[PDB]
């Protein structure tokens, strides 16, 4: 194997996405969906814990570098069940569903490759094993805020108020917990360097949870402009 062994709260009126509907409209429209309460208790994390998923999550981060690369979703996060794994390269996004034998403290290891002049990332250090892969999606990579919901076998994603729909995925798997996927690097540059010294800039992310609440969405010509809940 390759695995390595390595709060504050807030509140704001964001976390609005097109209401799981792709219908065009130009007036106010009510909706009973899974939404984020406007002045709810958001948790401010420093990095890294396995967080519950519940019915949805609000995720946002202002991290300057390319340290936060994605997330892992699933139940036991073991080889016993299938899990979701989103990874963002500088050029691509990669979404796979397999039976990942995840590491206790997963991270996307960044290392120097002397024969290519380049830095590269290793999905080892994230999972020691990966079998029974049923789904693989590849396209361009994803303040950066996301909404994740897993309903009717589909995993739906909105990004950027008014979070536009990013993509939704016929995953068809149960998702109860998730963890943020960090990119760590290491280099042999001083005679005393330690191979265990994986490091990166300080990374922090906001996590909220979605609630089943009636909302009102104001459309003018395209994007949702205002919103309302009580």
């Amino acid at each position, epitope marked *: 194997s390759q695995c390595v062994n390595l709060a504050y709260t807030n509140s704001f009126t964001r976390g609005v996405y097109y209401p799981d509907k792709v219908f065009r409209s130009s007036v106010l429209h009510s909706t009973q969906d899974l939404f984020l309460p406007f002045f709810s208790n958001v948790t401010w994390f420093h990095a890294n814990p396995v967080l519950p998923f519940n019915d949805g999550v609000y995720f946002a981060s202002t991290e300057k570098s390319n340290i936060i690369r994605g997330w892992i979703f699933g139940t036991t996060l073991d080889s016993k069940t299938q899990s979701l794994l989103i990874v963002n390269n500088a050029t691509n996004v990669v979404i796979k569903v397999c039976e990942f034998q995840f590491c206790n403290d997963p991270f996307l290891g960044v290392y120097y490759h*002397k024969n290519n002049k380049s830095w590269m990332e290793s999905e080892f250090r994230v999972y020691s094993s990966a079998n029974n892969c049923t789904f693989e999606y590849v396209s361009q990579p994803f303040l950066r805020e996301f909404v994740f919901k897993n309903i009717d076998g589909y995993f739906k994603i909105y990004s950027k108020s008014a979070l536009e729909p990013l993509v939704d995925l016929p995953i068809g798997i149960n998702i109860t917990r998730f963890q943020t996927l960090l990119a760590l690097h290491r280099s042999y540059l001083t005679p005393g360097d330690s191979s265990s010294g994986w490091t990166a800039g300080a990374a922090a992310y906001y996590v909220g949870y979605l609630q089943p609440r009636t909302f009102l969405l104001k459309y003018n010509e395209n994007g949702t402009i205002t919103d309302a809940v009580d």
Partner: antibody
Amino acid sequence: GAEVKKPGASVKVSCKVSGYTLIEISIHWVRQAPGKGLEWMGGFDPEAGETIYAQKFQGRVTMTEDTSTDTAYMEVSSLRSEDTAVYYCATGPAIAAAETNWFDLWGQGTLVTVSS
Amino acid sequence: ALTQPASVSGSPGQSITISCTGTSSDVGSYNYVSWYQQHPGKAPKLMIYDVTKRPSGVPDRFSGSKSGNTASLTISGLQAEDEADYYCSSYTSSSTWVFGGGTKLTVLG
């Protein structure tokens, strides 16, 4: 382990490097004849992206690497009695963008005796 | 080859310097001078790299400098354990490394 060799034969010394992998490290080889000083045989130049050999040894020394096992090899051929020495592997940086260059010896070397 | 004095001696507590005279092809054109310490029967130990920098663990009594084509290692407060062989090493404009002949260092007893 120590190697005894008749003149004109060849030897292949090994070096198992833990910690960082071989792909993210420059490997050098130095030797020291009994009672004499250190002699640099060859090593990986970060700016060149490949291994450079001392001109005294080009054509007769070959260094290779097994990224699977993380073992560095060096093979000396047509060896004469002047090749009796302790052979040291050494680890150095590989990133050419940094402006550090050096090699740190790895283990306690292997003795290679050539005698008829 | 780089040129070092064959031998150098000093009393405990004193300072000494070992010089490493190269050429424009190595010490004159690059800041890649290393210094190695070798006790009898043991593998050389890196003491200085990049002319002046010391690896973690090496005491601050060891210091390096460069002037023109000449690099120098200086040891302050000679200890009995400092008695060893010292080799300088320099990067060359042929992308190779070269060694000095070695300086035997005696802490006078």
